[PDB]
Design a protein around this nucleic acid. Structure first.
Ligand SMILES: [Mg+2]
Ligand SMILES: [Mg+2]
Ligand SMILES: [Mg+2]
Ligand SMILES: [Mg+2]
Ligand SMILES: [Mg+2]
Ligand SMILES: [Mg+2]
Ligand SMILES: [Mg+2]
Ligand SMILES: [Mg+2]
Ligand SMILES: [Mg+2]
Ligand SMILES: [Mg+2]
Ligand SMILES: [Mg+2]
Ligand SMILES: [Mg+2]
Ligand SMILES: [Mg+2]
Ligand SMILES: [Mg+2]
Ligand SMILES: [Mg+2]
Ligand SMILES: [Mg+2]
Ligand SMILES: [Mg+2]
Ligand SMILES: [Mg+2]
Ligand SMILES: [Mg+2]
Ligand SMILES: [Mg+2]
Ligand SMILES: [Mg+2]
Ligand SMILES: [Mg+2]
Ligand SMILES: [Mg+2]
Ligand SMILES: [Mg+2]
Ligand SMILES: [Mg+2]
Ligand SMILES: [Mg+2]
Ligand SMILES: [Mg+2]
Ligand SMILES: [Mg+2]
Ligand SMILES: [Mg+2]
Ligand SMILES: [Mg+2]
Ligand SMILES: [Mg+2]
Ligand SMILES: [Mg+2]
Ligand SMILES: [Mg+2]
Ligand SMILES: [Mg+2]
Ligand SMILES: [Mg+2]
Ligand SMILES: [Mg+2]
Ligand SMILES: [Mg+2]
Ligand SMILES: [Mg+2]
Ligand SMILES: [Mg+2]
Ligand SMILES: [Mg+2]
Ligand SMILES: [Mg+2]
Ligand SMILES: [Mg+2]
Ligand SMILES: [Mg+2]
Ligand SMILES: [Mg+2]
Ligand SMILES: [Mg+2]
Ligand SMILES: [Mg+2]
Ligand SMILES: [Mg+2]
Ligand SMILES: [Mg+2]
Ligand SMILES: [Mg+2]
Ligand SMILES: [Mg+2]
Ligand SMILES: [Mg+2]
Ligand SMILES: [Mg+2]
Ligand SMILES: [Mg+2]
Ligand SMILES: [Mg+2]
Ligand SMILES: [Mg+2]
Ligand SMILES: [Mg+2]
Ligand SMILES: [Mg+2]
Ligand SMILES: [Mg+2]
Ligand SMILES: [Mg+2]
Ligand SMILES: [Mg+2]
Ligand SMILES: [Mg+2]
Ligand SMILES: [Mg+2]
Ligand SMILES: [Mg+2]
Ligand SMILES: [Mg+2]
Ligand SMILES: [Mg+2]
Ligand SMILES: [Mg+2]
Ligand SMILES: [Mg+2]
Ligand SMILES: [Mg+2]
Ligand SMILES: [Mg+2]
Ligand SMILES: [Mg+2]
Ligand SMILES: [Mg+2]
Ligand SMILES: [Mg+2]
Ligand SMILES: [Mg+2]
Ligand SMILES: [Mg+2]
Ligand SMILES: [Mg+2]
Ligand SMILES: [Mg+2]
Ligand SMILES: [Mg+2]
Ligand SMILES: [Mg+2]
Ligand SMILES: [Mg+2]
Ligand SMILES: [Mg+2]
Ligand SMILES: [Mg+2]
Ligand SMILES: [Mg+2]
Ligand SMILES: [Mg+2]
Ligand SMILES: [Mg+2]
Ligand SMILES: [Mg+2]
Ligand SMILES: [Mg+2]
Ligand SMILES: [Mg+2]
Ligand SMILES: [Mg+2]
Ligand SMILES: [Mg+2]
Ligand SMILES: [Mg+2]
Ligand SMILES: [Mg+2]
Ligand SMILES: [Mg+2]
Ligand SMILES: [Mg+2]
Ligand SMILES: [Mg+2]
Ligand SMILES: [Mg+2]
Ligand SMILES: [Mg+2]
Ligand SMILES: [Mg+2]
Ligand SMILES: [Mg+2]
Ligand SMILES: [Mg+2]
Ligand SMILES: [Mg+2]
Ligand SMILES: [Mg+2]
Ligand SMILES: [Mg+2]
Ligand SMILES: [Mg+2]
Ligand SMILES: [Mg+2]
Ligand SMILES: [Mg+2]
Ligand SMILES: [Mg+2]
Ligand SMILES: [Mg+2]
Ligand SMILES: [Mg+2]
Ligand SMILES: [Mg+2]
Ligand SMILES: [Mg+2]
Ligand SMILES: [Mg+2]
Ligand SMILES: [Mg+2]
Ligand SMILES: [Mg+2]
Ligand SMILES: [Mg+2]
Ligand SMILES: [Mg+2]
Ligand SMILES: [Mg+2]
Ligand SMILES: [Mg+2]
Ligand SMILES: [Mg+2]
Ligand SMILES: [Mg+2]
Ligand SMILES: [Mg+2]
Ligand SMILES: [Mg+2]
Ligand SMILES: [Mg+2]
Ligand SMILES: [Mg+2]
Ligand SMILES: [Mg+2]
Ligand SMILES: [Mg+2]
Ligand SMILES: [Mg+2]
Ligand SMILES: [Mg+2]
Ligand SMILES: [Mg+2]
Ligand SMILES: [Mg+2]
Ligand SMILES: [Mg+2]
Ligand SMILES: [Mg+2]
Ligand SMILES: [Mg+2]
Ligand SMILES: [Mg+2]
Ligand SMILES: [Mg+2]
Ligand SMILES: [Mg+2]
Ligand SMILES: [Mg+2]
Ligand SMILES: [Mg+2]
Ligand SMILES: [Mg+2]
Ligand SMILES: [Mg+2]
Ligand SMILES: [Mg+2]
Ligand SMILES: [Mg+2]
Ligand SMILES: [Mg+2]
Ligand SMILES: [Mg+2]
Ligand SMILES: [Mg+2]
Ligand SMILES: [Mg+2]
Ligand SMILES: [Mg+2]
Ligand SMILES: [Mg+2]
Ligand SMILES: [Mg+2]
Ligand SMILES: [Mg+2]
Ligand SMILES: [Mg+2]
Ligand SMILES: [Mg+2]
Ligand SMILES: [Mg+2]
Ligand SMILES: [Mg+2]
Ligand SMILES: [Mg+2]
Ligand SMILES: [Mg+2]
Ligand SMILES: [Mg+2]
Ligand SMILES: [Mg+2]
Ligand SMILES: [Mg+2]
Ligand SMILES: [Mg+2]
Ligand SMILES: [Mg+2]
Ligand SMILES: [Mg+2]
Ligand SMILES: [Mg+2]
Ligand SMILES: [Mg+2]
Ligand SMILES: [Mg+2]
Ligand SMILES: [Mg+2]
Ligand SMILES: [Mg+2]
Ligand SMILES: [Mg+2]
Ligand SMILES: [Mg+2]
Ligand SMILES: [Mg+2]
Ligand SMILES: [Mg+2]
Ligand SMILES: [Mg+2]
Ligand SMILES: [Mg+2]
Ligand SMILES: [Mg+2]
Ligand SMILES: [Mg+2]
Ligand SMILES: [Mg+2]
Ligand SMILES: [Mg+2]
Ligand SMILES: [Mg+2]
Ligand SMILES: [Mg+2]
Ligand SMILES: [Mg+2]
Ligand SMILES: [Mg+2]
Ligand SMILES: [Mg+2]
Ligand SMILES: [Mg+2]
Ligand SMILES: [Mg+2]
Ligand SMILES: [Mg+2]
Ligand SMILES: [Mg+2]
Ligand SMILES: [Mg+2]
Ligand SMILES: [Mg+2]
Ligand SMILES: [Mg+2]
Ligand SMILES: [Mg+2]
Ligand SMILES: [Mg+2]
Ligand SMILES: [Mg+2]
Ligand SMILES: [Mg+2]
Ligand SMILES: [Mg+2]
Ligand SMILES: [Mg+2]
Ligand SMILES: [Mg+2]
Ligand SMILES: [Mg+2]
Ligand SMILES: [Mg+2]
Ligand SMILES: [Mg+2]
Ligand SMILES: [Mg+2]
Ligand SMILES: [Mg+2]
Ligand SMILES: [Mg+2]
Ligand SMILES: [Mg+2]
Ligand SMILES: [Mg+2]
Ligand SMILES: [Mg+2]
Ligand SMILES: [Mg+2]
Ligand SMILES: [Mg+2]
Ligand SMILES: [Mg+2]
Ligand SMILES: [Mg+2]
Ligand SMILES: [Mg+2]
Ligand SMILES: [Mg+2]
Ligand SMILES: [Mg+2]
Ligand SMILES: [Mg+2]
Ligand SMILES: [Mg+2]
Ligand SMILES: [Mg+2]
Ligand SMILES: [Mg+2]
Ligand SMILES: [Mg+2]
Ligand SMILES: [Mg+2]
Ligand SMILES: [Mg+2]
Ligand SMILES: [Mg+2]
Ligand SMILES: [Mg+2]
Ligand SMILES: [Mg+2]
Ligand SMILES: [Mg+2]
Ligand SMILES: [Mg+2]
Ligand SMILES: [Mg+2]
Ligand SMILES: [Mg+2]
Ligand SMILES: [Mg+2]
Ligand SMILES: [Mg+2]
Ligand SMILES: [Mg+2]
Ligand SMILES: [Mg+2]
Ligand SMILES: [Mg+2]
Ligand SMILES: [Mg+2]
Ligand SMILES: [Mg+2]
Ligand SMILES: [Mg+2]
Ligand SMILES: [Mg+2]
Ligand SMILES: [Mg+2]
Ligand SMILES: [Mg+2]
Ligand SMILES: [Mg+2]
Ligand SMILES: [Mg+2]
Ligand SMILES: [Mg+2]
Ligand SMILES: [Mg+2]
Ligand SMILES: [Zn+2]
Lengths: 70, 95, 107, 97
RNA sequence: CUCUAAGCACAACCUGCGGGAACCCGUACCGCAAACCGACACAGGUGGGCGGGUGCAAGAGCACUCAGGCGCGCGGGAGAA
RNA sequence: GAAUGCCGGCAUGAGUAACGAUAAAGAGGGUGAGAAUCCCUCUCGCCGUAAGCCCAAGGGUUCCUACGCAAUGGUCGUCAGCGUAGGGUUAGGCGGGACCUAAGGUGAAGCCGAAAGGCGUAGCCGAAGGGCAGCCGGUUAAUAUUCCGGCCCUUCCCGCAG
RNA sequence: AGCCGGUAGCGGGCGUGGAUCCCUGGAUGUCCGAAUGGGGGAACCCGGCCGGCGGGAACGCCGGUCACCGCGCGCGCGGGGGGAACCUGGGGAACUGAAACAUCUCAGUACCCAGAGGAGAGGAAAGAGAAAUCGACUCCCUGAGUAGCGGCGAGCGAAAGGGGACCAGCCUAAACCGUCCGGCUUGUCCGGGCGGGGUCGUGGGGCCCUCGGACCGAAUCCCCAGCCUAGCCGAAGCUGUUGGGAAGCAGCGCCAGAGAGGGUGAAAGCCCCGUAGGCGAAAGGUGGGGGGAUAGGUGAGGGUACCCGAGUACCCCGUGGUUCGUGGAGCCAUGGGGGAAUCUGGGCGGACCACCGCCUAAGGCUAAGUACUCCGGGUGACCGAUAGCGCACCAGUAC
C-alpha cells in the first residue's frame, strides 16, 4: 500500500504480542480468501488489494518471527 | 502460519458444482496436499457449519502452449463437503 | 546501476537537433529503458486508429513521438539559456543539478 | 590376502621376468628377456589368537610381525580392560602402537 | 484359533449391544487399436473375461443372423494389350 | 569444378507410380461462401468366438461442449483423435498403500577383496500369490460397486452389560 | 524521479513523507537430492517420542526430535556429498613406432579409483660428489640431446655445477625427574596416562662437580592500513547551409593531466555515455602489509658412558624407481627369509677392500616462489551467423 501506511503498519504490529499477531494474520488470511472469492466471480475491480493483503500478511509474520527471536 | 484459509482456496464455479448446493454439497478448490480430515476442520472453521462427508479428487493441469512454448497449467484438487442436515454455506448460495 | 538521465519530467528543454531543432518545450515524460523523452508539441506523428470506444470515428490521432535524450538540453530557469548540467552538493549534503552557464539551480 | 593389521603390509605389484641365455659373467652372449608380466606379492598373513582380559582377540598379521602382537598383550596389562567388548579391546591394543 | 512367559489380575481379553471415528493414491478417455509396440490415422505385433440364435454328428469349426459395430479418408468413367 | 566431398537451395524423372486390404454403395432432405466426403432419413452391403462388450498393460486429455479450418488428415471438409476456450475423473466396502510373504533384491552379525567393491544369517523390501468388509437401480453433455435411493457389511476408539 | 521483471494490453496501484532499482546482513524457504526416523520405482509413501490444534479417544494436521560411522569422558565433536581444469597417492591399457615382431616403444600416457585444496606435492641432509667444496624444498633458464641407457635397433634420456624466482625453520621419541591410575611376581616392581626434561653432526642430549645469572620472538591471537562485494565528481560550441536528419561544408570561437572508445537521423574533443585526474562503505568478505600480544627461544669447561626412533639397519631371495633393459650394478624403495648395535654406534662416495672424506635411517609439521581457469575484468595485424563455443536466438533444447 502507501509507504506511510506500511510504516504505521510496522509500528503497530511491533506493539502487538505474538498472540495478537497470530490473531491478526488469521483475520487477514480470512479476508484474503474473501478477496480470492470476489476476484473469482469478477467482483474485485481493485485487484491491487490482493497483493497488498499478501504483503501485509508477510510483514506480520515477519514481525511475529521477530518477536520469538530477539 | 497455517490456517483454514490456507486449505480452502476458492469455490468451484461450474454448473456441476452449483447443482450440488441443493443437497448441501459444496465444491471447493483446496490445497493439493490437504487431507479429508483437514478440509473438514477447515470448512467448519471457515463457514460455521458441520461437515459430515468429504469427497476429494485431483485435477491435473491442462497442457497448453503459446506459439513455440509448450507448457502446463498447475495441478489442482477439488473437495466436495456435505454439511449437516439443514445447514447451508451462505458464501456459496450465491449463485 | 541506473540509466543516467540528464533531463527530467517536466523541466523545460531545447530540442537541439533533428527536424524540430530550436524548439523549446516541457518534458512530458522520460523513458529510461529507451533513453528517450517526450517533449510537448515536438515529434508529432499521425497514428491510425480503428473505429472503437475512444475513437468511434476511427481516423487518426496525433501522438508525440519519443526523442533520444541526447537531442535535448534543459533551459536554466535562472539565466534562461540552454546548458549542460553540472552537479553541486548543497550545504546539507544533497546534490542538485546546476547550470554550467551561470550556476543557477535546475531542480 | 589383505593387510597386516600391525604393520600395514599389503599386496604389492611386482613383475615376473622370464629370461633365457647364459649370463655374460659365465661367458655367454648375455641374458635375453622372453617375457615380462605383472603379478602380486602378498604379505605372509596369518591368524594370531590371543586371550586378553578373558576375551579372545584374533589378529590378521604378517608372519614378520607375529611377536609384535604379544608385545601389545604385555603393554595392555597396565590398561583397565575388563568389562570391554572384544572389538573395543583390539582397538586399545592397536592404539598402543 | 489355541497354549502358556514375563507382567497383570482397579488390569486385560471374549461375547453382545450403543455412540463416535475411518487417512493417502488411482478412477476422464483409447485399449486386437487411427489414442498401445512398429518413423505414418502402417493389411504386422499385443495378456485376462463375456462372446446370443439356427442348421450342419459334436464344437469356440462352418454358413446366415441378434445385440452391437462397421462399408476400411480420393473419386467418376471406360470395358485394349 | 570434381574428393560416390560437407551444408543448403533448386531441378530431372512427371502431371508419371501411388493415394495402404475387392466388406459396396444409391438417393432424398439439411447446413454452408464452398459438399461424392459433415448432419438427418430411407434403401443396400460387411463383421457377429467379432470388425460386438468388459478388464489389465501401455498411452497421457486423445473425453464432453462451444467456436474454428492455415497446417495435420494420403482427395475433399462445413467434419475430426486438429486449432482456441470452458467443463469433466467424487470410494471405510473396487484396485494399491497404512497387512503377509515368493524368486530375487537388500542386509545389524560376520566373511572377503589394491581402491571402487564382492559376499552374507536374521531382519527389511519385493505380487497379477495369501489375506481383507457392496450388491441392485437411478441420475450427468461428460463420473459413478465412488453421487443419489433401497437393503447390507468391516475395522478402529470410547462407554455399558455379561 | 520514476515504478509494478522479459511485456504491450485489460483492470488496478506505488513514489522527493525518497519508490522502482544496485550492494550487504537478516527473515521465510513445500518436496527430492550426501539425504540421514523407516521404506521407496528421486521429488512419493509410512512411523516412534514430546508439545499444540479440532467435539477429538479413534482420524488428521502443525512445531520439535529420532540414520550410520569415527574420535575423546549416555554427553560432545567430527565425518558423508559436490566442484571446470590443476595436484598427490593406489591401479593401469592398446592402437602405434621398431617399415614384420616378442625385449623395447607408445607410457606410468589414456582411463578407473582414493584423497587434498585454493593450490597440491616437496621440504630442513643417514643429501650432493671430488670442489681440501656446497648447504632445506619447490619453480624457470642453462648445463644438454651432454653423461649414459638401448633386440647398442627404433629410440630413450639424467645429475652435479652456473644464472635466476622465493626464502624459514620447527615440534617430538628415548635417557633422567614428578604425579596419577592399574596389576599381584609386593616393589628400589612392571605397565599406562599426564607434566617437566630434550632435539643435535665440530655430534648432541641425560645424570653428578666448579663457575658465569636480558636480548631474541612466531607460521598463533588481537588491532589497523590496503583491497573486494554498490557507487560518485569530472573541462570546453554557437550560427549559417545542403539535407528526412549534420556530426558534412562554411564562418567565428573554445577545452585538453581529458584528441581511448561508444552513441546521437550521415562523418561530433566541446550534445550524450564516457575518457585524463580525482572521490567513496554503516554491513559482509579479505588482510601475505604496519602495530601490538602470546607461545617460544638461550652458558662454559670437568667427570660419567645413561639415551639418541627395531622385526629396523644389515645380508640373501623376488621386484620397482633412476639415464641404467642383469650389466662390473652401486644408490633409493620393499613382498619373503635370516636378523644387529646406540657413537669405540651406523648409512654413503657405482661390485669389492684399504685409505681418505661426506652424512646421521627406521616419528611428525612447515609459509613463499609453482600449476589450473568454473568465476570477474582488461586487451587483440582473433571470428563475424556454413565463421566464432555444440548454442549471438527460450540449446545441451527439438529430435
Ligand atoms: Mg491468494
Ligand atoms: Mg488461479
Ligand atoms: Mg501472504
Ligand atoms: Mg510457512
Ligand atoms: Mg458444489
Ligand atoms: Mg485426498
Ligand atoms: Mg486440522
Ligand atoms: Mg479419491
Ligand atoms: Mg485421491
Ligand atoms: Mg488443475
Ligand atoms: Mg490449473
Ligand atoms: Mg492460478
Ligand atoms: Mg487447488
Ligand atoms: Mg548524474
Ligand atoms: Mg534554431
Ligand atoms: Mg517529443
Ligand atoms: Mg557533464
Ligand atoms: Mg542522499
Ligand atoms: Mg535531491
Ligand atoms: Mg526552479
Ligand atoms: Mg621372475
Ligand atoms: Mg672375462
Ligand atoms: Mg634378460
Ligand atoms: Mg638384455
Ligand atoms: Mg607392454
Ligand atoms: Mg599379467
Ligand atoms: Mg589370515
Ligand atoms: Mg597362529
Ligand atoms: Mg587361547
Ligand atoms: Mg622373520
Ligand atoms: Mg614406533
Ligand atoms: Mg510373574
Ligand atoms: Mg488390581
Ligand atoms: Mg457399529
Ligand atoms: Mg496417514
Ligand atoms: Mg493407467
Ligand atoms: Mg471412473
Ligand atoms: Mg470407464
Ligand atoms: Mg471402448
Ligand atoms: Mg490381431
Ligand atoms: Mg483380448
Ligand atoms: Mg475396439
Ligand atoms: Mg479408434
Ligand atoms: Mg498417433
Ligand atoms: Mg523402432
Ligand atoms: Mg501406430
Ligand atoms: Mg485409414
Ligand atoms: Mg493397424
Ligand atoms: Mg493373439
Ligand atoms: Mg475361456
Ligand atoms: Mg438373446
Ligand atoms: Mg454358447
Ligand atoms: Mg427368432
Ligand atoms: Mg437339414
Ligand atoms: Mg446346435
Ligand atoms: Mg459338424
Ligand atoms: Mg455358436
Ligand atoms: Mg467363424
Ligand atoms: Mg444392426
Ligand atoms: Mg452406415
Ligand atoms: Mg469401401
Ligand atoms: Mg477393416
Ligand atoms: Mg480407401
Ligand atoms: Mg478404357
Ligand atoms: Mg581440379
Ligand atoms: Mg551422390
Ligand atoms: Mg569424401
Ligand atoms: Mg561438389
Ligand atoms: Mg552432401
Ligand atoms: Mg545430405
Ligand atoms: Mg537455409
Ligand atoms: Mg539439398
Ligand atoms: Mg544437395
Ligand atoms: Mg526443394
Ligand atoms: Mg530444368
Ligand atoms: Mg521435380
Ligand atoms: Mg514436374
Ligand atoms: Mg496423364
Ligand atoms: Mg513415362
Ligand atoms: Mg502409366
Ligand atoms: Mg510408387
Ligand atoms: Mg502403395
Ligand atoms: Mg494410377
Ligand atoms: Mg481381406
Ligand atoms: Mg482401398
Ligand atoms: Mg480377393
Ligand atoms: Mg466376408
Ligand atoms: Mg451417394
Ligand atoms: Mg449419400
Ligand atoms: Mg425439394
Ligand atoms: Mg463433402
Ligand atoms: Mg466442400
Ligand atoms: Mg447428398
Ligand atoms: Mg467414402
Ligand atoms: Mg450423417
Ligand atoms: Mg428409398
Ligand atoms: Mg454366433
Ligand atoms: Mg503416445
Ligand atoms: Mg491437444
Ligand atoms: Mg484444414
Ligand atoms: Mg481445408
Ligand atoms: Mg483451404
Ligand atoms: Mg484460422
Ligand atoms: Mg493434409
Ligand atoms: Mg487436405
Ligand atoms: Mg495416410
Ligand atoms: Mg461453415
Ligand atoms: Mg471424439
Ligand atoms: Mg479438440
Ligand atoms: Mg470428462
Ligand atoms: Mg463409500
Ligand atoms: Mg496411521
Ligand atoms: Mg508393506
Ligand atoms: Mg515383510
Ligand atoms: Mg560391518
Ligand atoms: Mg583385487
Ligand atoms: Mg550385496
Ligand atoms: Mg538372503
Ligand atoms: Mg513390515
Ligand atoms: Mg524391493
Ligand atoms: Mg510388502
Ligand atoms: Mg496383493
Ligand atoms: Mg499358493
Ligand atoms: Mg490378491
Ligand atoms: Mg478390497
Ligand atoms: Mg452387500
Ligand atoms: Mg449398478
Ligand atoms: Mg450438467
Ligand atoms: Mg463414458
Ligand atoms: Mg450409498
Ligand atoms: Mg466390565
Ligand atoms: Mg483500470
Ligand atoms: Mg490499464
Ligand atoms: Mg523532502
Ligand atoms: Mg537513504
Ligand atoms: Mg520442513
Ligand atoms: Mg529418507
Ligand atoms: Mg532407505
Ligand atoms: Mg500428541
Ligand atoms: Mg468439528
Ligand atoms: Mg487430538
Ligand atoms: Mg498424523
Ligand atoms: Mg515427525
Ligand atoms: Mg561418493
Ligand atoms: Mg569434499
Ligand atoms: Mg595425476
Ligand atoms: Mg600414480
Ligand atoms: Mg595415476
Ligand atoms: Mg589389464
Ligand atoms: Mg604393443
Ligand atoms: Mg602390435
Ligand atoms: Mg607415433
Ligand atoms: Mg610395427
Ligand atoms: Mg610398420
Ligand atoms: Mg603386422
Ligand atoms: Mg607392438
Ligand atoms: Mg614394454
Ligand atoms: Mg602416443
Ligand atoms: Mg614406460
Ligand atoms: Mg588427462
Ligand atoms: Mg598462490
Ligand atoms: Mg602448500
Ligand atoms: Mg632434523
Ligand atoms: Mg638440492
Ligand atoms: Mg664447510
Ligand atoms: Mg650440515
Ligand atoms: Mg639456505
Ligand atoms: Mg657443452
Ligand atoms: Mg633405455
Ligand atoms: Mg626407447
Ligand atoms: Mg628407461
Ligand atoms: Mg620411459
Ligand atoms: Mg631425476
Ligand atoms: Mg653428477
Ligand atoms: Mg641454482
Ligand atoms: Mg609414568
Ligand atoms: Mg612426556
Ligand atoms: Mg615435554
Ligand atoms: Mg624445548
Ligand atoms: Mg620444550
Ligand atoms: Mg617440550
Ligand atoms: Mg634446534
Ligand atoms: Mg664429522
Ligand atoms: Mg657427550
Ligand atoms: Mg613467516
Ligand atoms: Mg611454529
Ligand atoms: Mg558525469
Ligand atoms: Mg562532458
Ligand atoms: Mg531544410
Ligand atoms: Mg549545426
Ligand atoms: Mg565546420
Ligand atoms: Mg587518451
Ligand atoms: Mg580502444
Ligand atoms: Mg566516437
Ligand atoms: Mg570527419
Ligand atoms: Mg565517429
Ligand atoms: Mg571512418
Ligand atoms: Mg563523438
Ligand atoms: Mg572521439
Ligand atoms: Mg583513474
Ligand atoms: Mg575514474
Ligand atoms: Mg578505489
Ligand atoms: Mg605484524
Ligand atoms: Mg633462530
Ligand atoms: Mg641453553
Ligand atoms: Mg649448548
Ligand atoms: Mg650406552
Ligand atoms: Mg638419530
Ligand atoms: Mg619411531
Ligand atoms: Mg625381514
Ligand atoms: Mg648397502
Ligand atoms: Mg631366482
Ligand atoms: Mg633387493
Ligand atoms: Mg628406471
Ligand atoms: Mg634395476
Ligand atoms: Mg628396470
Ligand atoms: Mg643399478
Ligand atoms: Mg637398503
Ligand atoms: Mg627385507
Ligand atoms: Mg661414527
Ligand atoms: Mg660402525
Ligand atoms: Mg642405506
Ligand atoms: Mg659401499
Ligand atoms: Mg656420498
Ligand atoms: Mg668408489
Ligand atoms: Mg653424505
Ligand atoms: Mg636427519
Ligand atoms: Mg604442505
Ligand atoms: Mg608453495
Ligand atoms: Mg574470462
Ligand atoms: Mg569477458
Ligand atoms: Mg573479418
Ligand atoms: Mg545463420
Ligand atoms: Mg553456428
Ligand atoms: Mg548473411
Ligand atoms: Mg563467415
Ligand atoms: Mg555460450
Ligand atoms: Mg560458454
Ligand atoms: Mg552448430
Ligand atoms: Mg528450442
Ligand atoms: Zn543559468
Amino acid at each position: 500500500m502507501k509507504l506511510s501506511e506500511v510504516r504505521k503498519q510496522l509500528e503497530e504490529a511491533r506493539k502487538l504480542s505474538p498472540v495478537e499477531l497470530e490473531k491478526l494474520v488469521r483475520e487477514k488470511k480470512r479476508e484474503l480468501m474473501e478477496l480470492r472469492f470476489q476476484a473469482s466471480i469478477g467482483q474485485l475491480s481493485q485487484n491491487h488489494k490482493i497483493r497488498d493483503l499478501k504483503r501485509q500478511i508477510a510483514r506480520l509474520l515477519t514481525v511475529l518471527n521477530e518477536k520469538r527471536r530477539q | 502460519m497455517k490456517t483454514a484459509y490456507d486449505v480452502i482456496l476458492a469455490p468451484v464455479l461450474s454448473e456441476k458444482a452449483y447443482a450440488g448446493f441443493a443437497e448441501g454439497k459444496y465444491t471447493f478448490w483446496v490445497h493439493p496436499k490437504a487431507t479429508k480430515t483437514e478440509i473438514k476442520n477447515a470448512v467448519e472453521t471457515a463457514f460455521k457449519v458441520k461437515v459430515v462427508k468429504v469427497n476429494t479428487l485431483h485435477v491435473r493441469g491442462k497442457k497448453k502452449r503459446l506459439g513455440r512454448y509448450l507448457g502446463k497449467r498447475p495441478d489442482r484438487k477439488k473437495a466436495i463437503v456435505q454439511v449437516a442436515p439443514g445447514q447451508k454455506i451462505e458464501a456459496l448460495e450465491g449463485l | 546501476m541506473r540509466v543516467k538521465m540528464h533531463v527530467k519530467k517536466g523541466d523545460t528543454v531545447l530540442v537541439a537537433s533533428g527536424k524540430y531543432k530550436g524548439r523549446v518545450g516541457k518534458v512530458k515524460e522520460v523513458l529510461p529503458k529507451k533513453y528517450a523523452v517526450i517533449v510537448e508539441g515536438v515529434n508529432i506523428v499521425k497514428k491510425a486508429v480503428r473505429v472503437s470506444p475512444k475513437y468511434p470515428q476511427g481516423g487518426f490521432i496525433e501522438k508525440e513521438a519519443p526523442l533520444h535524450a541526447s537531442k535535448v538540453r534543459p533551459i536554466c530557469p535562472a539565466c534562461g539559456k540552454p546548458t549542460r548540467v553540472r552537479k553541486k552538493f548543497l550545504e546539507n549534503g544533497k546534490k542538485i543539478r546546476v547550470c554550467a552557464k551561470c550556476g543557477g539551480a535546475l531542480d | 590376502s589383505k593387510v597386516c593389521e600391525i604393520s600395514g603390509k599389503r599386496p604389492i605389484v611386482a613383475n615376473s621376468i622370464q629370461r633365457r641365455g647364459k649370463a655374460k659373467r659365465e661367458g655367454g652372449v648375455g641374458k635375453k628377456t622372453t617375457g615380462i608380466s605383472k603379478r602380486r606379492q602378498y604379505p605372509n598373513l596369518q591368524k594370531v589368537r590371543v586371550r586378553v582380559a578373558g576375551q579372545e582377540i584374533t589378529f590378521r598379521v604378517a608372519a614378520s610381525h607375529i611377536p609384535k602382537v604379544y608385545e601389545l598383550v604385555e603393554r595392555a596389562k597396565g590398561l583397565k580392560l575388563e568389562g570391554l567388548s572384544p572389538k573395543e579391546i583390539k582397538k586399545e591394543l592397536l592404539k598402543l602402537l
